[PDB]
Write an enzyme that holds these catalytic residues in place. Structure first.
Site, mmCIF file in Angstrom:
data_model
loop_
_atom_site.group_PDB
_atom_site.id
_atom_site.type_symbol
_atom_site.label_atom_id
_atom_site.label_comp_id
_atom_site.label_asym_id
_atom_site.label_seq_id
_atom_site.Cartn_x
_atom_site.Cartn_y
_atom_site.Cartn_z
ATOM 1 C CG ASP A 36 -2.689 2.807 -1.530
ATOM 2 O OD1 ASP A 36 -3.255 3.670 -2.233
ATOM 3 O OD2 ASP A 36 -1.889 1.970 -1.994
ATOM 4 C CE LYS A 58 0.227 9.014 -3.917
ATOM 5 N NZ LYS A 58 0.177 7.757 -3.121
ATOM 6 C CG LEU A 96 -1.952 -1.128 1.312
ATOM 7 C CD1 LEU A 96 -2.939 -0.865 2.440
ATOM 8 C CD2 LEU A 96 -2.688 -1.318 -0.005
ATOM 9 C CG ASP A 97 2.064 5.084 -2.676
ATOM 10 O OD1 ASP A 97 2.935 5.386 -1.832
ATOM 11 O OD2 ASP A 97 2.075 5.519 -3.847
ATOM 12 C CB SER A 98 1.910 7.805 1.233
ATOM 13 O OG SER A 98 3.284 7.465 1.186
#
Lengths: 115, 125, 79, 95, 69, 217
Positions: C41, E43, C37-39
RNA sequence: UUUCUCCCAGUACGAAAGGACAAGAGAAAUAGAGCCACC
């Protein structure tokens, strides 16, 4: 009063208008029964060696009372299909265009700033 | 009477894929509501545009005059100006390109506003 | 409060979100390595949990939980 | 019409379709829409509109004339039209 | 990356709440748009730039969803 | 005693009765809408009903540059730069659609007309629309701004250098040499300062008007 | 004085496609006769 000649400023993000050019765009006619062009009057502007229809949104001629007198001639490009050539307008645009007779909803929607 | 809630419900009835309505505070001197509508195809755009006007004329609006339909010739952008609300109807892909929703939601902070540029127009001599 | 109810409900809210793939959605399901999982997420996953239980969870210690049972414990001990 | 000298003017002309907005009874002043040919302080002739639309407007007006001698009901000093915004009224808001 | 990631979490949730409280617009599109907005911007950002993004959203959060009606 | 310009009638053959009736209506409207005292060069904020908008008012802030008209048809113009665009709006004092008039900053400028500010630098014409009202003293003369504006390149809307204009707020020295002023001075027409045929006496009229205005109050 | 739009009305009519009248309203344009409250 956008009469014949009347160097004008292209207030649009269209490629032709946005790109600088050595010759100013000129207006030597108006899409009206009369020859004088005012706010809300369609025109055809020669830009980057090409001809594109434009809509007048401001003029330097003295106006009627209760209205703001602009110091520069501003126009917005309109495609043949009727949609504006540019997707955004930078200079403030008077809100009287809404009530003015004609099709101005598309241009007004593209106008960020209203005075 | 014909008001915002009736039209949006009618837009949903005809299955408008994307609807965006932006209210205008009293300080801002423009229409109270600005509406943006999506439609799958030009055929759908024509049908939905006609439906709203037909309902509007039937739904009282006696004091208001009849509303002409603008942009029917264009296959990707149809706009109808009602008394208290303006609906701009386009295709889904056209929606993102123009980003009418960003303009009104971010009155001065819309990114595309910065995209506009300036020029220089000197005389030949 | 029901610890079992929190555990299953915490799993339920985790299951609700579609983007994350519940290939192994165990009570000890880790985020960074097990689920990749990314940040963003973990940012959004906690919010789904917050909606069910009325939020009040700050990210100062939420991002350190890294697994459903730890947030279950954090929910249990703060309730 | 005002005379312009050798070049003209000084000829009778008529303007049609001028509405009346208000009448002042105390000073016998009539307010007439539009412009009237001639110079200021010049006598003019006033008569009912002869346009086909206003063929019979005297039915609801004093038929021979208005007689202050009768004094059936004293008229207000200033008479206003319904659309006319009278002075001292609240500021008009386009709501 | 953020000065405080707590604001980012609260920011995302609040946008979702207003979407469910937003009637005239199409809720489906708004949810997708907000998700795309988070993905495109958050991001990669700088601390100073990230502060503006979260700060402006906080005003967007506290201002009736910035006029979305 | 500040007698507003509109009350003073202009010379002519028009019957004085019209002015008397017009003044009575003007005074009645003044009760409905309060007209604050202001002079050219003062920054004002005026509230007006919007015809395009429904039940929404408009406030425009700008420095007063010109006062024109008489009687009920008197109008005033205030200028400002908005979004980098110089804009001038003419407001009719007794128009029913003007909701309120606010004098944000009551002050006077060197010249009675500020049309030359268009030829001046933008900063002299730029004013914050949201600027709050500044303190003012009722029983005093309005502050007189003696700052001299700087002009843009020589091509101007009007030949301010000419003696007839007699502009006292322009930094002509910076943009014009003394020889150029002498060329402008060729249109001096010195007899005009001494000509009694262009003088109109309203002292008695002004004095009489004051009591009439106060009596209605 | 002339023109355009709207309305009547997506109605009449027509299998559909398509698509009116007259009456009414608003916009302009030019010509003619005037006028200076404002600009």
């Amino acid at each position: 009063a956008v009469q014949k000649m009347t160097r004008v400023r292209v207030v649009d993000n269209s490629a032709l208008g946005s790109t600088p050019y050595h010759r100013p765009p000129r207006c030597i006619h108006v899409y009206n029964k009369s020859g004088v062009g005012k706010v809300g009057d369609q025109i055809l502007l020669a830009i980057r060696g090409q001809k594109k229809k434009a809509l007048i949104v401001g003029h330097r001629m003295p106006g009627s009372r209760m209205t703001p007198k602009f110091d520069s001639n501003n126009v917005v490009l309109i495609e043949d299909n009727g949609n504006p050539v540019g997707t955004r307008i930078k200079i403030p645009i008077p809100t009287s265009l809404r009530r003015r007779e004609g099709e101005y909803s598309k241009v007004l929607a593209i106008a960020q700033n209203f005075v | 009477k014909f008001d915002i809630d009736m039209l949006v419900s009618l837009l949903r009835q005809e299955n408008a894929r994307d609807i965006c309505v932006i209210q205008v505070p009293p300080e801002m001197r423009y229409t109270d509501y600005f509406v943006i509508g999506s439609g799958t195809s030009t055929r759908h755009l024509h049908a939905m545009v006609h439906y709203l006007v037909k309902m509007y004329k039937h739904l009282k609006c006696r004091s208001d005059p009849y509303v002409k339909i603008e942009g029917k010739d264009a296959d990707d952008w149809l706009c109808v100006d009602f008394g208290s609300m303006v609906i701009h109807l386009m295709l889904p892909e056209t929606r993102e390109t123009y980003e009418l929703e960003k303009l009104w939601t971010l009155r001065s902070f819309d990114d595309q506003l910065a995209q506009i540029a300036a020029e220089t127009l000197p005389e030949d001599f | 409060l029901t610890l079992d109810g929190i555990k299953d409900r915490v799993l339920y809210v985790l299951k609700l979100y579609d983007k994350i793939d519940p290939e192994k959605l165990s009570v000890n399901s880790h985020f960074m390595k097990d689920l990749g999982l990314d940040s963003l997420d973990q940012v959004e996953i906690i919010m789904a949990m917050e909606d069910e239980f009325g939020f009040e969870i700050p990210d100062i210690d939420a991002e350190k939980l890294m697994c459903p049972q730890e947030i279950v414990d954090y929910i249990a001990d703060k309730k | 019409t005002i005379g312009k000298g050798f070049q003209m003017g000084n000829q009778n002309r008529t303007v049609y379709g001028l509405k009346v907005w208000r009448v002042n009874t105390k000073h016998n002043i009539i307010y007439v829409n539009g412009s009237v040919p001639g110079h200021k302080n010049c006598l003019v002739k006033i008569k009912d509109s002869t346009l086909p639309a206003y063929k019979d407007s005297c039915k609801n007006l004093p038929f021979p004339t208005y007689f202050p001698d009768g004094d059936e009901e004293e008229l207000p000093e200033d008479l206003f039209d319904e659309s006319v915004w009278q002075p001292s009224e609240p500021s008009i808001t386009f709501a | 990356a953020p000065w405080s990631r707590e604001a980012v979490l609260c920011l995302y949730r609040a946008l979702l709440r207003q979407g469910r409280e937003l009637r005239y617009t199409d809720r489906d599109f708004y949810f997708a748009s907000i998700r795309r907005e988070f993905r495109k911007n958050q991001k990669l950002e700088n601390l100073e730039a990230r502060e503006k993004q979260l700060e402006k959203g906080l005003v967007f959060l506290h201002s009736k969803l910035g006029g979305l009606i | 005693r500040f007698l507003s310009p509109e009350f003073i009638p202009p010379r002519g053959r028009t019957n004085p009765l019209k002015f008397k009736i017009e003044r009575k209506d003007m005074l009645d409207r003044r009760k409905v809408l309060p007209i604050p005292e202001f002079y050219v060069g003062s920054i004002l904020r005026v509230t007006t009903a919007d015809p395009y908008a429904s039940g929404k008012t408009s406030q425009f802030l700008g420095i007063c540059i010109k006062r024109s008209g008489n009687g009920l048809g008197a109008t005033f113009t205030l200028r400002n730069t908005i979004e980098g665009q110089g804009v001038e709006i003419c407001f009719e004092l007794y128009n029913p659609r003007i909701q309120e008039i606010q004098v944000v900053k009551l002050e006077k400028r060197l010249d009675d007309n500020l049309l030359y500010l268009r030829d001046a630098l933008p900063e002299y014409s730029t004013f914050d629309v949201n600027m709050k009202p500044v303190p003012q003293e009722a029983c005093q003369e309005v502050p007189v701004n003696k700052l001299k504006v700087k002009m843009k390149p020589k091509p101007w809307s009007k030949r301010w250098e000419r003696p007839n204009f007699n502009i006292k707020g322009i930094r002509f020295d910076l943009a014009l040499t003394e020889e150029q002023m002498k060329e402008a001075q060729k249109w001096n027409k010195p007899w005009i300062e001494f000509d009694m045929m262009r003088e109109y006496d309203t002292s008695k009229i002004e004095a009489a008007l004051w009591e009439e205005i106060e009596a209605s109050k």
